[PDB]
């Protein structure tokens, strides 16, 4: 274990945050692409 938090809320969905480096930009920003590298992560579900 690392930490425990008494948040006291219900959670049904979650999302992953990924840090990206701006490979290049465009004027009048149209959400140009970034680069972090292969972003390889797993996700699993626990059961009783």
């Amino acid at each position, epitope marked *: 274990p690392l930490v425990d938090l008494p948040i006291g809320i219900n959670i049904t969905r979650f999302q992953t945050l990924l840090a990206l480096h*701006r490979s*290049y*930009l*465009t*004027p*009048g*920003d*149209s959400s*140009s692409g970034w680069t972090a590298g292969a972003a390889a992560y797993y996700v699993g579900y626990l059961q009783p």
Partner: antibody
Amino acid sequence: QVQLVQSGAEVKKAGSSVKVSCKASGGTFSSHTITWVRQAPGQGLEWMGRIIPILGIANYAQKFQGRVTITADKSTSTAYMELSSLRSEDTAVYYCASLQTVDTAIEKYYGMDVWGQGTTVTVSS
Amino acid sequence: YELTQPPSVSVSPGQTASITCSGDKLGDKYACWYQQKPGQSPVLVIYQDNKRPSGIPERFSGSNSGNTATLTISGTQAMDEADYYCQAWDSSTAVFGGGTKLTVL
């Protein structure tokens, strides 16, 4: 997307308070640091400063120390500032622009993505 | 911190134009070059290192040397009449130079 449309030219007497503002009407007012740069004929560009709406921290320029009072309010979704003690030599065209970022150390990783049409000001004496 | 550049530059159309924006310790500072045309507002063409943003035609180019920044122009046309201003975010402030006016015969 954002347009940063502002008011047109204004005529006023010398020595009076000068008020100018830029309104987006496009994308969100926040999330986009707004800076003002002055364009003059045969004198290059002059940098005034920048104000971050969400952060609320305003940075001043060396020559504009104490002559500008920049304020921004999220509720009104408009950025306006006050100017005083303006001389005829200081008359020029003012422009407003966005930086796409709201972090103090991240402006260098960006540029003035969009500019305004320019609001020329004339001083009558 | 202080920027000094030639007042103007002239070059024949279709040639390679090299513009030098000299200063004091401007290498490794993320300089930015802007373009302003007569009757049109300034636009962004270079960002953070000689970097051409996608959507602008790939006619501008350049590199940042130890103590000098250079801009290379390819496929110059008549419409390229504009003024180039080189600036950088130094000491949490922006400094704008005199700028150069490009002349085409």
